[PDB]
């Protein structure tokens, strides 16, 4: 039964102290081996586990299932409430999986929606999940479309978000240093928040 399978996952995954590949691989196999109706039921049951590793497994399933708007909304609104930081990392990966499946250019309205969400975890999942942004389709040929979107969050009230924003710009600066330099030149570094983001973003820029 489904309940018995979740119990097995709890026994097996609770031993895993680091990483995410074991949970990811199992989620992928299960997603590919069963019809969507079944796997959606399993993902919701697994996500209620008190074992965070099993919730990680469930959020990978959500990512594979995320063409279903109901699943994507649950990711946006409910998984974003998870108190476990490792689950939050998987949320970022599952969002990236959504974007990859529908296509990054086609995903832009959703990316913009998540970046403007009220939940800081929703904003961070988008910023972090797409790193390195300019390695992704669309953004790799249009790097300012990534830089501008990330830089919009440079005054975010959340330090969690700001660290992701600064790091995401930092990523891009390693392959497009002039474009990041050009973006940063306009910043008025007056707040504690923007200076934190600037310090992360500008490490490899000859400003
Ligand atoms: Cl990457
Ligand atoms: Na990553």
Numbering used by the authors: 0 to 206
Question: What do the authors of the reporting publication say about this deposited model?
Answer:
The HEAT-like repeat (HLR) DNA glycosylases exist in all domains of life and are structurally and mechanistically distinct from their base-flipping counterparts. Here, we describe a new family of proteins related to the HLR DNA glycosylases that lacks DNA binding specificity as well as alkylpurine excision activity. We identified a fifth family, which we designate AlkD2, not present in B. cereus but spread across phylogenetically diverse bacteria, commonly in species which also possess AlkD.
Crystallographic analysis revealed that Streptococcus mutans AlkD2 is structurally similar to AlkD but lacks the DNA penetrating B-helix. We developed improved crystallization conditions that provided electron density for the missing parts of the search model, permitting a more complete and detailed structural analysis. Interestingly, SmAlkD2 retains a largely positively charged concave surface despite its low sequence similarity to AlkD.
